Design a protein around this nucleic acid. Structure first.
Ligand SMILES: [Mg+2]
Ligand SMILES: [Mg+2]
Ligand SMILES: [Mg+2]
Ligand SMILES: [Mg+2]
Ligand SMILES: [Mg+2]
Ligand SMILES: [Mg+2]
Lengths: 99, 150, 125, 208, 138
RNA sequence: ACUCCUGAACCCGGGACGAAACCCCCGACGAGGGGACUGACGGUACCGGGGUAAUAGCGCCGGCCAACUCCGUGCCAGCAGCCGCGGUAAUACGGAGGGCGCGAGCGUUACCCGGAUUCACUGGGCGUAAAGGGCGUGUAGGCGGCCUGGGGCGUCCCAUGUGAAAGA
RNA sequence: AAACCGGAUUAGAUACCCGGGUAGUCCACGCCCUAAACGAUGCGCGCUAGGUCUCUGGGUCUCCUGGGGGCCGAAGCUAACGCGU
RNA sequence: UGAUGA
RNA sequence: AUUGAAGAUU
């Protein structure tokens, strides 16, 4: 069955496209503890419809670009800017890590 | 009459004005091979009186070894100082698979199927002492039942 | 370490080092001699020990022990090398195999004949 | 393979009579009557107090030396026995005891195992009628172990099979003396054997 | 803040018995209670009951020992020899039914929490379900 | 040694399975029936007859580690996996008698896992053994008191598909 | 008071002892970022006998009850020495 | 202030 | 020559 993934929209800065952060969590093969881990997907939003902070389902799809390979199936809930907030700060930590 | 095996003899030494002064230590086990063993540490000016002295202390220091056909009720680990022993039950056919020290002790309680591991410090004296504490620590279905009834 | 810590750094595989660059792993290497000096041992040992400087097919040039009663090696001698330190001679970590190439076997050798490389003699045998 | 050298000579050393000759090892010596001590220049100087290791060694030496099977082959049989279901010490015995060369001897067709082994190599034996020249051949229960009718003549087959006329045989075997043949009824129970040998110690020698 | 309440209880209990106390309060939680029930039933504790202290809900735990003992050192054997947390907030631990441990060849217990409630290991095994492996106890 | 017995090798005789199809005939170019050709291995395997007492080596014997004695040698010549042997009585060097171990093999070197709970998930530690950051502040992150309800992501259960053959 | 200049001492004395002496020690501002930076013991929370000395609160002020500083030491721990609300 | 190797 | 034997010492 075409994979269905649910995540948070963290970018509408592209035409007909959204970046979706999908968290995943599981037992660590050796050390046991349940650990989180995530991935951004670029998903197809043809009616520039879903916006920054929406939770969406993402569905395994016939390719649209190099790297566009999922389409936005539906919307789960609006608003969730905390999640976007989380991602953004984590992103800015990065400056405070080089030389 | 129990059986009696000598696990260890060593020669120690102290110092006095001109020259060292030797002594001997003896680790001896005694067992009826039917669920009764004892450990004995005997020291003396000469090997014999030492060994012999061990014998004597071994019989004064004895344990309930609740065999359940060749083997022990359950698993135990015991720490003795930096020395550790693990004892594991085995179905008949296996043998006493142990190091020389606890083999000796297990064999003379008439254990015939056991799996062991020496961990930590492998110093004989303390391994032997742990082994005994381990056996001394085994309970059986019965004893547990008694304990928990109230 | 905490378990989070092990998730963060993990343990580190103790991967350790050869005592014998007879390079390409190789159980033996072929060399040609250069010196056939004698060396004093160390420690609490006294004697005149047999050694060659060997220039190797490894590309490497190193010192090797010449075991047994007496040898027949000099400057251009051409020899097989085997690894086996000497332990009295720090910096000697390879033996010369006796009975291969320009290294004679040990003449007059009755007992551990297989090392030293000496054929079954004929007497009453 | 197989040993070939001085023998009622470990009837010695191993401390105890192995009947390896059999015929003689019954009568003023397995060599072991005249000198019950280890061989060589030193063999009757004061016994060295032997190590836990030494002990285990000799004991397996003993057992193996009895069937004159070689270390390689012995070991394979043991590992076979370990991994097999049931009490490994015994099973091993069953298994050594199933070697044709041993059974040929247990049935009395020969007076020793070394002599028995030769009768097997030299075509003198059958199993269920069909001929078999492997000492190592595994005899299973129900198998009939004949003298080969062609061999039934020789002064040896005669003498040994005659000798058996009075003789009793293994609870786990049967032997029709007249028709020069035996049956292998079941594999021997530890109790059926009277081997001068503590197998639990052998198992122990194959631990470390 | 107190970071593993259930650790706490096991420890309070471990601690009180080695100085042979008659009883120990532990601040009360439904889950704590559920574990106590097992202890009680399996005959490790006498029993337990709710109580208040400074007017906040606790659970008095009545502990249980052996008889006074032979020679030098007359201290009773312990009934609760060993009481150990397995799953922890640092590292959660879950077992399928085929892999629930057998504690001290059965002479011991392993409390273990399932979606069919909190159960000893035999209990769980019987109802063919697994879950979070709470603690062993022997 | 020597008596008897058997008879690896070697000689003689016979001698394979692996191959029944394609094809042809009958039938109907089908089903089914009948017939013929074909063997590199190979005169091999195997069967029968005859028949000779017919190969033993390597490592080791201070402790760990099973196996001890005499010469030689004198910190030399040498041994040596680690600990260590040798300075005129060496079970440790070299030889010899004897002994232990394995056997068409036995040793050596190289490399991998083991033992090594010596990277420790199972299963380790940090006062003086190696190991607490010179101290704070607090970012990400990790962790989170008591009660009730929803959801069911983790987790658990039943069915089912998948997990080729080899290997085990 | 490093350095340095002298005086002694000494087998010698680029030192210990003695007489001098610059940097520095002091201040302001900016650096450096180290240490036997030690309790050689990371931070928080819960639990597990007591005795005695002490600083600092509160109470019904023999005492009781908080928060610091000490020592002795239940249980326990530790290779030992020790540690021990 | 010094006291050669085993 | 000396030492257990050596280095060193005539
Ligand atoms: Mg410890
Ligand atoms: Mg260690
Ligand atoms: Mg460590
Ligand atoms: Mg340190
Ligand atoms: Mg000196
Ligand atoms: Mg020396």
């Amino acid at each position: 069955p075409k994979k269905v993934l649910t995540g948070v929209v963290v970018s509408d800065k592209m035409q007909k496209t959204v970046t979706v952060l999908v968290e995943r969590q599981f037992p660590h093969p050796l050390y046991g503890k349940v650990i989180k881990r995530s991935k951004k997907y670029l998903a197809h939003d043809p009616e520039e419809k879903y916006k920054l902070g929406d939770v969406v389902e993402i569905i395994e799809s016939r390719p649209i670009s190099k790297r566009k390979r999922f389409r936005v199936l539906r919307l789960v809930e609006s608003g969730r800017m905390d999640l976007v907030e989380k991602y953004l700060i984590r992103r800015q930590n990065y400056e405070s890590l080089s030389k | 009459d129990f059986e009696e095996k000598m696990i260890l003899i060593r020669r120690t030494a102290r110092m006095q004005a001109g020259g060292r002064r030797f002594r001997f230590g003896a680790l001896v086990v005694v067992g009826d091979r039917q669920g009764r063993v004892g450990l004995g540490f005997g020291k003396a000016p000469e090997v014999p009186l030492a060994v012999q002295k061990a014998g004597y202390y071994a019989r004064r220091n004895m344990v309930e070894v609740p065999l359940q056909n060749g083997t022990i009720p359950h698993e135990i680990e015991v720490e003795f100082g930096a020395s550790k022993i693990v004892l594991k039950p085995a179905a008949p056919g296996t043998g006493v698979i142990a190091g020389a020290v606890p083999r000796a002790i297990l064999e003379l309680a008439g254990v015939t199927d056991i799996l062991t591991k020496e961990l930590g410090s492998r110093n004989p004296i303390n391994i032997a002492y742990a082994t005994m504490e381990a056996l001394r620590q085994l309970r059986t279905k019965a004893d547990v039942e008694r304990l928990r009834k109230g | 370490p905490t378990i989070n810590q092990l998730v963060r750094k993990g343990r580190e595989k103790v991967r350790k080092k050869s005592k014998v660059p007879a390079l390409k792993g190789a159980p033996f290497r072929r060399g040609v001699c250069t010196v056939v000096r004698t060396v004093t041992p160390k420690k609490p040992n006294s004697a005149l020990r047999k050694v060659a400087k060997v220039r190797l097919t490894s590309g490497y040039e190193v010192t090797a022990y010449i075991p047994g009663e007496g040898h027949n090696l000099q400057e251009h001698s051409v020899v097989l090398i085997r690894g086996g330190r000497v332990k009295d001679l720090p910096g000697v970590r390879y033996h010369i195999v006796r009975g291969v190439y320009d290294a004679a076997g040990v003449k007059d050798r009755k007992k551990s004949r297989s090392k030293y490389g000496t054929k079954k003699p004929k007497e009453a045998a | 393979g197989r040993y070939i050298g001085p023998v009622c000579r470990l009837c010695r050393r191993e401390g105890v009579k192995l009947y390896l000759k059999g015929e003689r090892c019954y009568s003023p010596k397995c060599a072991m009557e005249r000198r019950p001590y280890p061989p060589g220049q030193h063999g009757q100087k004061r016994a060295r107090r032997p190590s836990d290791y030494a002990v285990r060694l000799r004991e397996k030496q003993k057992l193996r030396r009895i069937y004159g099977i070689s270390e390689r082959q012995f070991r394979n049989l043991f590992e076979e026995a370990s991994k097999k279901k049931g009490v490994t010490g015994s099973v091993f015995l069953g298994l050594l005891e199933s070697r044709l060369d041993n059974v040929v001897y247990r049935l009395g067709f020969a007076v020793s195992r070394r002599q028995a082994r030769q009768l097997v190599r030299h075509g003198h034996i059958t199993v269920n009628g069909r001929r078999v020249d492997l000492p190592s051949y595994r005899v299973r229960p129900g198998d009939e172990i004949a003298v080969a009718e062609k061999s039934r003549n020789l002064e040896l087959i005669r003498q040994n099979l005659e000798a058996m006329k009075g003789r009793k045989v293994g609870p786990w075997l049967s032997l029709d003396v007249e028709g020069m043949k035996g049956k292998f009824l079941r594999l021997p129970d530890r109790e059926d054997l009277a081997l001068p040998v503590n197998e639990q110690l052998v198992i122990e020698f194959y631990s470390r | 803040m107190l970071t593993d309440p259930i650790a706490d209880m096991l420890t309070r209990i471990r601690n009180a018995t080695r100085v042979y106390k008659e009883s120990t309060d532990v601040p009360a939680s439904r889950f704590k209670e559920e574990i106590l029930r097992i202890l009680a039933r399996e005959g490790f504790i006498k029993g337990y009951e709710r109580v208040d202290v400074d007017g906040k809900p606790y659970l008095r735990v009545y502990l249980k020992y052996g008889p006074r003992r032979q020679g030098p050192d007359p201290r009773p054997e312990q009934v609760i020899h060993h009481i150990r947390r397995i799953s922890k907030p640092g590292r959660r631990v879950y077992v399928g039914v085929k892999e629930i441990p057998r504690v001290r060849r059965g002479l011991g217990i392993a409390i273990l929490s399932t979606s069919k409630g909190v159960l000893t290991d035999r209990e769980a095994r019987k109802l063919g379900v697994g879950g979070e492996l709470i603690c062993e106890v022997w």
